[PDB]
């Protein structure tokens, strides 16, 4: 039954039916047991595609809203609000799965860092659509989760580890886009890159392609943001 839901989610992935995939992986997580690496990635892939659609739509609609400064604006605004509602419910869905199930059962250091990066990501997506009243506290929940993940990652993972690098990349984007700090975003990205490139002998064939890909993305962001 757990294997059955996992195989259906893999099938939904190939079919590009991410609502279905998410439902499958959600109910796997709700069974209580710790997820394997395969399962972990299916859960995140599923939920990432489901929110992404809303983020992309939200941005397009916000953009339309801004360059109609009259009645067209009320329509856009209302449609944006419909989209934000959808987005929040998806973000709260994952965060409930992280609080109630995934973070508590994380026995390995890499599971713990992975789920805290997720927690950071989904509070960041809530920050993207939050107003001043609630935003301050949403941002701090994201930062707190990222920082804890970053500290554990610094202690217990090698600099080339794909999860450390991917954490650096996302925490950097948090600094740049959410906290309007180009310099803090740039040093995070630069440190992760420089440390990984110094220890390039440490890469496994199991994840050399992941690690090198993420390194390129770090440096791409760095190159853009200092120019």
């Amino acid at each position: 039954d757990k294997n059955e839901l996992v195989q259906k989610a893999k099938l939904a992935e190939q079919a590009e039916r991410y609502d279905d995939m998410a439902a499958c992986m959600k109910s796997v997580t709700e069974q209580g047991a710790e997820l394997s690496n395969e399962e972990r990635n299916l859960l995140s892939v599923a939920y990432k595609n489901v929110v992404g659609a809303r983020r992309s739509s939200w941005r397009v609609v916000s953009s339309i809203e801004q360059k109609t400064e009259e009645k067209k604006q009320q329509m856009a605004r209302e449609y944006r609000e419909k989209i934000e509602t959808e987005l929040r419910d998806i973000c709260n869905d994952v965060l409930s799965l992280l609080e109630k199930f995934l973070i508590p059962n994380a026995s390995q250091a890499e599971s713990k860092v992975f789920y805290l990066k997720m927690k950071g990501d989904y509070y960041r997506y809530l920050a993207e659509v939050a107003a001043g009243d609630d935003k301050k506290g949403i941002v701090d929940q994201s930062q707190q989760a990222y920082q804890e993940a970053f500290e554990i990652s610094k202690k217990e993972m090698q600099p080339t580890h794909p999860i450390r690098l991917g954490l650096a990349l996302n925490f950097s984007v948090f600094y740049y886009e959410i906290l309007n700090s180009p310099e803090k975003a740039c040093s995070l990205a630069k440190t992760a890159f420089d440390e990984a490139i110094a220890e390039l002998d440490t890469l496994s064939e199991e994840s050399y392609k992941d690690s090198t890909l993420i390194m390129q993305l770090l440096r791409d962001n760095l190159t853009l943001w200092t120019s």
Binding site: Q14, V45, S63, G166, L217, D220
Partner: peptide, 17 residues
């Protein structure tokens, strides 16, 4: 930062059968 701007974070990438 336009309406078609992607935040350059971790992509859901390097998947295969």
């Amino acid at each position: 930062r336009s309406g078609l701007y992607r935040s350059p974070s971790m992509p859901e990438n390097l998947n295969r059968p």
